[PDB]
Structure 1
Amino acid sequence: VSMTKTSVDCTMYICGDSTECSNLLLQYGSFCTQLNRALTGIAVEQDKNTQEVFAQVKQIYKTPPIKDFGGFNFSQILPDPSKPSKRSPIEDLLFNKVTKFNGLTVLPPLLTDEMIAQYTSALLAGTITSGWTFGAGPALQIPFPMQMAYRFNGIGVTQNVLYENQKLIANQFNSAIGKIQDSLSSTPSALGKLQDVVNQNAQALNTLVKQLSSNFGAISSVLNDILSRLDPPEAEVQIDRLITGRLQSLQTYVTQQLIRAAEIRASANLAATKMSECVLGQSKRVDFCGKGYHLMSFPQSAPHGVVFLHVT
């Protein structure tokens, strides 16, 4: 849903505390300003991605004090008061599974993980109690067996089937939730997408930091040795070479970040569409939300992403 909200100070990256390199950079034009603008646009885009995905709900909803849902057990997806941060057990394992100052800063996300979990809990409470009505008007209470009967009516199976198989369906749903719990617990590459995003961003940042250490054809990579060894005339050309190298490296980083942010925005729009059409309603699109005839969906906040449990 969102990627790491990072900004890079171009003037500080290309040239450190030195002022001569800053003067040589000022004559390159508005390259650093444009790069800063691009990175700030990416950061605000990440905030917008998280907002659009999660703040689909207008009012923070809350589950009833006693969870009597006709046998359907939501304990694995609903928040538990015991642990300090009100994250569900599945949310806990999602958060557990996913695991630089040269002008480099990592702006904190506007939405804390706690209020992202609060949006997720509100969506879960609205889905459980009000059905899909909480996304198309005022949230409208309805017993959960009745809501799942309406979902059955949606898939083309008359509501007779559920009311005559409520116990078996409840047990199947609970067991499916438990097996999802264990499959997430065991498989290491279950959360491969989010970890891939995090690793890709970290590898790009490490590549930039290493590129700080490259000669780029200059006498040496370190700035101060270039300044001390050579007189200002030749220092100017050496610094210009090093500036071209570092500017090309940072432009490459910014371009790759723009493309990755476009990919993440496509995925965040897909996640927002999935939330709207599967959490806030029941979708007739085939294979859009789970393999099979869609019944429900439960959002689960995961680090820099979202996890959907498409009940089918």
Structure 2
Amino acid sequence: YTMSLGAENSVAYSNNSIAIPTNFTISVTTEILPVSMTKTSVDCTMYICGDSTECSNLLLQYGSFCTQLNRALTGIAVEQDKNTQEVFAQVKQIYKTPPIKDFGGFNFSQILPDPSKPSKRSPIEDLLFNKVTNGLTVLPPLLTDEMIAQYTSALLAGTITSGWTFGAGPALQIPFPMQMAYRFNGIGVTQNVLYENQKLIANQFNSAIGKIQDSLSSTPSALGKLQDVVNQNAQALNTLVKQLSSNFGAISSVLNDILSRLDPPEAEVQIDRLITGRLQSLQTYVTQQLIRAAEIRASANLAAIKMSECVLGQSKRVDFCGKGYHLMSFPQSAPHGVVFLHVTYVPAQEKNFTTAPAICHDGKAHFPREGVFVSNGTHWFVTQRNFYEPQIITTDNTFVSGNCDVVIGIVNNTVYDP
């Protein structure tokens, strides 16, 4: 079939009609970003020749190919730990949540660490870690999973107990409803909207976090990025090992067989064929690792920027920290990556209204100070732009500029003087 690009939606545009949301939805979405690879090292001489010594003598004629390959792999290995450090070590104090979890109805149990588990991981982190599964050595990462989880818990405690203040200086405590009221102010919604709807917002947030856990649990393809990184590394290593079974034009792929069947005259050229084939395979693997490491470094830099701009603060950048008006983000450690839970404000239940650019009163043109003029059909109100909160048009929520003769579409109404 010819694919469908989406559902057609003819927006009801007119020159005096506006749609103002009357409700909202608190949505949480996951973003998965790989951070580090598996740090591999290669004993180049061992890979090419194994234990035979005259093969290494022949390999000596090629100069410093092995040293350069080892240098590249060492650079990649150090780069992985650097990537993890830039993503997760974004604070120098390990914050802790208070023993009493009274956050005005908000419930972070699914992202806060679980003391019962020996690993000290959150339920979402535990689920994430459960889903993701010849001279070659694998070096352990400098940061353990427990220490990455400790960073993640410190970031979570900092943002829950102090908001964005801990990312710009000393952590300043603030009650969480007031913190989310600040975040509501950051997206152009007045904070009384939050205070009058605190229980509903808390319930929506808790339900969204629970749905995130259920969605991650029940979808085996959600963590495909980290699994792809792991599978690519494992497949590259498997290909490198399997390249040793190729004879590359020689009589055999085993150096011992060539050595025990032929004298040095032709054994030298057969071993040279094996050496150039295996060295080409190793160089191909190292170049592929360098390209893959560049991609992973780009992803890790992006993840560090996401951490700084979504977890340590509220971001005005559209779609950077989830779909909708960003409120806050929570980091979660994952195998070789980081998962961001983006809490966004999604307007809902919009309503049609008749709007005007200005109100003409007493021969003067009034414009809203921070809102928008709307008409419910008979009366004119001024409401904030992202939530229907009709208010009487007064001289305090409007300002005057000129007269009514210039503005196109100015409507007549009374502006009440308090």
TM-score, normalised to structure 1's length? 0.99
Q: For residue 148 of structure 1, report the CA deviation from its aligned partner.
A: 0.5
Q: For residue 233 of structure 1, report the CA deviation from its aligned partner.
A: 1.1
Residues of 1 paired with 2:52 and 2:243: CA distance?
19
Asked if 1:11 corresponds to 2:55, the answer is: no
Residues of 1 paired with 2:194 and 2:255: CA distance?
73
Q: For residue 226 of structure 1, report the CA deviation from its aligned partner.
A: 1.1
RMSD: 0.5
Q: Deviations over 1:134-162 (max 9, x none)?
A: 00000110000111011111111111111
Which shows bigger deviation, 38-47 or 6-15? 6-15
Q: For residue 9 of structure 1, report the CA deviation from its aligned partner.
A: 1.1
Residues of 2 paired with 1:289 and 1:127: CA distance?
15
Asked if 1:238 corresponds to 2:270, the answer is: yes
Q: For residue 8 of structure 1, report the CA deviation from its aligned partner.
A: 1.0
User: Which residue matches 2:145?
Assistant: 113
Residues of 2 paired with 1:71 and 1:214: CA distance?
64
More strand by share: 2
Q: For residue 93 of structure 1, report the CA deviation from its aligned partner.
A: 0.4
Q: Deviations over 1:40-93 (max 9, x none)?
A: 000000000000000001111100011111111000000010010100000000
SS at match of 1:63: coil
Q: For residue 105 of structure 1, report the CA deviation from its aligned partner.
A: 0.4
Q: For residue 294 of structure 1, report the CA deviation from its aligned partner.
A: 0.4
SS at match of 1:268: helix
Q: For residue 3 of structure 1, report the CA deviation from its aligned partner.
A: 0.6
Q: For residue 290 of structure 1, report the CA deviation from its aligned partner.
A: 0.2
Structure 2: runs of 5+ lacking an equivalent: 1-34, 345-418
User: Which residue matches 1:61?
Assistant: 95
Q: For residue 256 of structure 1, report the CA deviation from its aligned partner.
A: 0.3
SS at match of 2:342: coil
SS at match of 1:141: coil
Q: For residue 235 of structure 1, report the CA deviation from its aligned partner.
A: 0.8
Residues of 2 paired with 1:169 and 1:151: CA distance?
13
Q: For residue 286 of structure 1, report the CA deviation from its aligned partner.
A: 0.4
Which shows bigger deviation, 226-235 or 269-278? 226-235
TM-score, normalised to structure 2's length? 0.74
Q: For residue 239 of structure 1, report the CA deviation from its aligned partner.
A: 0.6
More helix by share: 1
Residues of 2 paired with 1:87 and 1:287: CA distance?
29
Residues of 1 paired with 2:63 and 2:266: CA distance?
22
Q: For residue 110 of structure 1, report the CA deviation from its aligned partner.
A: 0.2
SS at match of 1:306: strand
Residues of 2 paired with 1:296 and 1:140: CA distance?
17
Asked if 1:301 corresponds to 2:333, the answer is: yes
Residues of 2 paired with 1:295 and 1:222: CA distance?
62
Residues of 2 paired with 1:67 and 1:4: CA distance?
38
Residues of 2 paired with 1:147 and 1:109: CA distance?
36
Q: For residue 227 of structure 1, report the CA deviation from its aligned partner.
A: 1.0
SS at match of 1:67: coil
User: Which residue matches 2:216?
Assistant: 184
Residues of 1 paired with 2:46 and 2:173: CA distance?
56
Q: For residue 223 of structure 1, report the CA deviation from its aligned partner.
A: 1.4
Specify the structure having the higher radius of gyration (Cα).
2
| % identical aligned pairs | 100
Residues of 2 paired with 1:72 and 1:291: CA distance?
21
Q: For residue 222 of structure 1, report the CA deviation from its aligned partner.
A: 1.1
SS at match of 1:62: coil
Q: For residue 21 of structure 1, report the CA deviation from its aligned partner.
A: 0.8
Q: For residue 94 of structure 1, report the CA deviation from its aligned partner.
A: 0.1
SS at match of 2:106: coil
